[PDB]
């Protein structure tokens, strides 16, 4: 299936200090393999993944150096951002960025990604053509105006299509055993009384990788969408994920309901009930 690399960067300005806090985190197939924190004692990208240890000093050097560059970039942008939104002083602000590339089972590019956000909201994102921009609001327009004039897109476009793709292939080659692995989910159902004539049924899926998964409930046939609480997939802490789905079933009538779990490492959809 698909593969990807992402670099989630966060810069949070803060009063009384002119150095915003910068935290950059790289992921591969949505798995942390590198991190940088401006608040650490000696800032530098650190290996967050076992297969990332083989990288030599030259590597970490260049990477860290770039992070140093980003800090300035975020330090500045954050500043202009303050002016754009005629914001005041001694407040704390957040500017985030997501960068990266998606690949198909064939390791050939699918999408190029670049988009920023200010205060948790969309600000500006490079469109899928890797040529134009999309500004979330008025302010963002000025940045687009300037970014079109500088022709920045071509620069990011190059990265997204060359070095992003190329370096992902490598990490994938190195993280072979870790990344391209899959853990089938392990499901089970639980019972609880909810209302007077109703009952809560919870379909559990545990210890699976990758995170992506599909849990569905259905009345002896068609699927169910009413009063069906599906919890946000969460990390188990050991690298595998968990998730569950509940459905308000009328007491007594229960073996009539069934849930199916869909997942890569699954030879065929898990089906089960109470």
């Amino acid at each position: 299936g698909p593969h990807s690399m992402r670099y989630f960067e966060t810069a949070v300005s803060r009063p009384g200090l002119e150095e915003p806090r910068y935290i950059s985190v790289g992921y591969v197939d949505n798995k942390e393999f590198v991190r940088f924190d401006s608040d650490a004692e000696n800032p530098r990208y650190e290996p967050r993944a076992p297969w990332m240890e083989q990288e030599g000093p030259e590597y970490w050097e260049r990477e860290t150096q770039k992070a140093k560059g980003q800090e300035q970039w975020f330090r500045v942008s954050l500043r202009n951002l303050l002016g754009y939104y005629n914001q005041s002083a001694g407040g704390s602000h957040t500017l985030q960025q997501m960068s990266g590339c998606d690949l198909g089972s064939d390791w050939r590019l699918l999408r190029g990604y670049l988009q920023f956000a200010y205060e948790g909201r969309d600000y500006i994102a490079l469109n899928e053509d890797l040529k134009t921009w999309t500004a979330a609001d008025m302010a963002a327009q000025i940045t687009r105006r300037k970014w079109e004039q500088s022709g920045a897109a071509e620069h990011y476009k190059a990265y997204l299509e060359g070095e992003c793709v190329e370096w992902l292939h490598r990490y994938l080659k190195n993280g072979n055993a870790t990344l391209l692995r899959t853990d089938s989910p392990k499901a089970h159902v639980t019972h609880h009384p909810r209302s007077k004539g109703e009952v809560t049924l919870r379909c559990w899926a545990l210890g699976f990788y990758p995170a992506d998964i599909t849990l569905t409930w259905q009345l002896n046939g068609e699927e169910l969408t009413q009063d069906m609480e599906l919890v946000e997939t969460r990390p188990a802490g050991d690298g595998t994920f968990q998730k569950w789905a509940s459905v308000v079933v009328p007491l007594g009538k229960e073996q009539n309901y069934t849930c199916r779990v869909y997942h890569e490492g699954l030879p065929e959809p898990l089906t089960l009930r109470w």
Partner: peptide, 9 residues
């Protein structure tokens, strides 16, 4: 392999 934005916001 991190990216490097050069034109500021």
């Amino acid at each position: 392999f991190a990216p490097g934005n050069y034109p500021a916001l």
